Design a protein around this ligand. Structure first.
Ligand code: 21G
Ligand code: CL
Length: 162
């Protein structure tokens, strides 16, 4: 069965995961209690303006292949995938006001809290994610933290289908 996150419809296409609650420490030193998915899984992500295929494991993005209508729509998909990955570099990229601990009995979803944080401005997320050298795969291109294309380098695990 499918579920929506960040305006993408997710469908699990392979694998499985078990759940473990973990109290992580954000970059601005707040505690979030997140349900960590442990396992090796593949998802499709279908949005109104971008599509992606995500392979991930426990708190790790392994591969994301993305297509979309413009740079902004591609970036939107990437930010959703980087939060959904639950990666420590994404948790440590949170900056600014302590606006996760301030909601009283609202009990907001920590994954949605993170997403709304990074949708505001993903520059620190992209700068801390990491880049790698890429193989030359015809029809695929790298995307750098400034969302410009590269034939040589890319955000770690991420490729754009031109
Ligand atoms: O935990 C949640 O409240 C929700 C919100 C935050 C992410 C998902 C979509 C919205 C999550 N829902 C679901 N996640 C997942 C799920 C599998 N592997 C994952 N890895 C990381 C992750 F993060 C969520 C998942 N499966 C079924 C779901 F139905
Ligand atoms: Cl929420």
């Amino acid at each position: 069965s499918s579920f929506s996150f960040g305006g993408f419809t997710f469908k699990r296409t392979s694998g499985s995961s078990v759940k473990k609650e973990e109290e992580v420490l954000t970059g601005n030193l707040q505690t979030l209690k997140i349900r960590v998915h442990e396992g090796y899984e593949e998802f499709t992500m279908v949005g109104r303006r971008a599509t992606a295929i995500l392979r991930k494991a426990t708190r790790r993005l392994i591969q994301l292949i993305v297509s979309g209508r413009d740079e902004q729509s591609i970036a939107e998909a990437i930010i959703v995938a980087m939060v959904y990955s639950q990666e420590d570099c994404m948790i440590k990229a949170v900056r600014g006001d302590l606006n996760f601990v301030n909601r009283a009995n609202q009990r907001l979803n920590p994954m949605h809290q993170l997403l709304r944080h990074f949708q505001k401005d993903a520059k620190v997320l992209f700068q801390n994610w990491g880049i790698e050298s890429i193989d030359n795969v015809m029809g695929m291109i790298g995307i750098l933290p400034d969302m410009t294309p590269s034939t040589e380098m890319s955000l770690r695990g991420i490729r754009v289908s031109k």
